Amino acid sequence: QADMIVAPLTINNERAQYIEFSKPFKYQGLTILVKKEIPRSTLDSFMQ
Amino acid sequence: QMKYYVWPRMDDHLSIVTLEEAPFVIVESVDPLSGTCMRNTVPCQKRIGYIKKCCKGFCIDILKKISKSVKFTYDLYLVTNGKHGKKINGTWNGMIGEVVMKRAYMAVGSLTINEERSEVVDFSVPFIET
Amino acid sequence: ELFFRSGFGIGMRKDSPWKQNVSLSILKSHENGFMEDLDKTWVRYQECD
Amino acid sequence: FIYDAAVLNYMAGRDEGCKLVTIGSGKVFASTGYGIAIQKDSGWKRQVDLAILQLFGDGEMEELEALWLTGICHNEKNEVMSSQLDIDNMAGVFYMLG
Amino acid sequence: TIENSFVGWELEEVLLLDMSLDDGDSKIQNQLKKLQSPIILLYCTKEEATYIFEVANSVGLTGYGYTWIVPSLVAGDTDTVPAEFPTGLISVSYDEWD
Ligand SMILES: *[C@@H]1O[C@H](CO)[C@@H](O)[C@H](O)[C@H]1NC(C)=O
Numbered sequence: 001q002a003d004m005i006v007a008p009l010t011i012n013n014e015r016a017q018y019i020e021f022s023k024p025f026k027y028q029g030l031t032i033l034v035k036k037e038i039p040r041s042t043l044d045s046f047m048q
Numbered sequence: 049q050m051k052y053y054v055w056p057r058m059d060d061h062l063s064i065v066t067l068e069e070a071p072f073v074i075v076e077s078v079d080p081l082s083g084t085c086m087r088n089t090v091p092c093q094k095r096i097g098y099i100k101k102c103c104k105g106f107c108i109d110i111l112k113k114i115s116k117s118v119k120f121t122y123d124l125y126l127v128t129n130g131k132h133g134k135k136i137n138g139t140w141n142g143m144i145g146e147v148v149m150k151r152a153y154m155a156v157g158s159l160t161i162n163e164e165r166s167e168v169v170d171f172s173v174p175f176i177e178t
Numbered sequence: 179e180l181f182f183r184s185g186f187g188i189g190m191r192k193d194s195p196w197k198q199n200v201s202l203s204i205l206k207s208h209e210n211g212f213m214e215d216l217d218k219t220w221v222r223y224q225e226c227d
Numbered sequence: 228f229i230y231d232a233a234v235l236n237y238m239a240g241r242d243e244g245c246k247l248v249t250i251g252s253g254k255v256f257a258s259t260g261y262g263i264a265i266q267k268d269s270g271w272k273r274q275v276d277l278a279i280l281q282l283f284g285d286g287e288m289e290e291l292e293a294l295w296l297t298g299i300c301h302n303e304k305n306e307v308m309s310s311q312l313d314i315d316n317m318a319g320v321f322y323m324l325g
Numbered sequence: 326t327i328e329n330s331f332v333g334w335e336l337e338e339v340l341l342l343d344m345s346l347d348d349g350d351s352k353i354q355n356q357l358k359k360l361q362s363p364i365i366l367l368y369c370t371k372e373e374a375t376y377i378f379e380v381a382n383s384v385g386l387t388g389y390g391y392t393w394i395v396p397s398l399v400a401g402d403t404d405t406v407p408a409e410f411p412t413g414l415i416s417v418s419y420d421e422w423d
Pocket residue numbers: 195196199
């Protein structure tokens with residue numbers, strides 16, 4: 001049904017068996033994100 | 049003292065061409081105790097008159113693992129004509145210069161990929177960003 | 179910290195007649211900086227850091 | 228100095244005094260990569276690339292650089308090591324009376 | 326000598342054949358099946374050597390990628406060369422021509 005894939009597509013050994021990948025747009029890995037804690041920031045007051 | 053500098057040969061016997069710079073490839077002089085490269089090193093000649101030398105580094109560590117899995121042989125030798133390679137009057141020198149002239153058949157080390165150099169040789173997937 | 183680095187690519191069916199004649203335009207566009215302009219107009223702009 | 232990035236970052240992280248830094252905290256402009264040049268239309272080109280991709284999978288590639296490409300001058304938090312203030316820093320106060 | 330040397334000499338698959346009973350069995354060939362490496366050392370006599378190559382050459386791990394070196398014992402007088410010696414045999418012997 002298709003002749004070319006144009007979308008974010010990583011590269012790995014299993015997928016490289018059956019198709020070609022040319023050369024990258026841009027280089028990036030992968031990380032983790034968690035919620036911020038800035039609600040629990042260091043506040044201030046006169047009496048502190 | 050042997051009449052032959054190197055043993056005569058008897059496509060799994062491939063030639064490689066390398067350049068020396070950065071932690072990627074490091075050149076060190078031979079041990080004077082025995083005149084051989086020590087542990088964790090790959091032999092590498094050097095033209096100009098042939099002198100033995102020891103080559104080691106990060107990039108060479110790749111060439112050990114790749115050649116072991118695909119099961120082929122090699123024998124490195126450093127280049128003796130200029131830097132990585134520059135076109136002058138439609139001629140190629142350096143590491144690129146050897147591969148186009150079929151005297152090398154493969155170059156490893158620290159090359160940089162761009163459009164001009166893909167009109168003569170072919171690269172593979174990059175293994176470090178630059 | 180980044181722990182498995184690779185890169186998005188354009189994938190095609192094996193041995194199509196464009197295997198090697200497309201990856202020059204991707205590779206040449208980096209020199210012109212054209213890949214940079216697309217970066218600063220679709221990825222990075224105003225934010226709270 | 229305008230040179231290849233994969234050499235500067237190693238060099239700027241393994242220098243005494245930690246007095247050298249890359250602008251933009253790791254800024255690169257035209258992103259290309261290193262590689263292994265092979266003779267045109269060689270039969271090996273199909274196997275060498277597959278081998279390299281596998282080294283990503285088992286993490287061998289991602290720990291070798293911890294063995295050859297590490298430094299001590301951490302480029303984190305932008306350590307200033309004092310300011311040693313001068314005339315220039317307090318410019319406005321010498322202007323306020325003016 | 327191997328232990329007190331910085332060069333990484335290594336040895337494995339040390340073989341020993343029993344040419345005493347001369348049963349004629351393939352105990353030589355069966356033992357040599359588990360062999361590798363391009364350098365193989367030999368230490369025998371000229372008369373008994375011809376049998377050694379025949380079985381070894383029958384397997385074929387002698388043609389291209391394997392080199393054999395023999396001490397001065399298998400030399401004769403360097404005037405006649407008995408057959409079954411593999412091509413490109415390199416060996417040492419007491420000086421004769423000089
Ligand atoms: C390949 O690209 C060149 C660009 O100069 C073009 O002339 C040629 O027609 C292209 N061939 C194919 C098969 O796409």
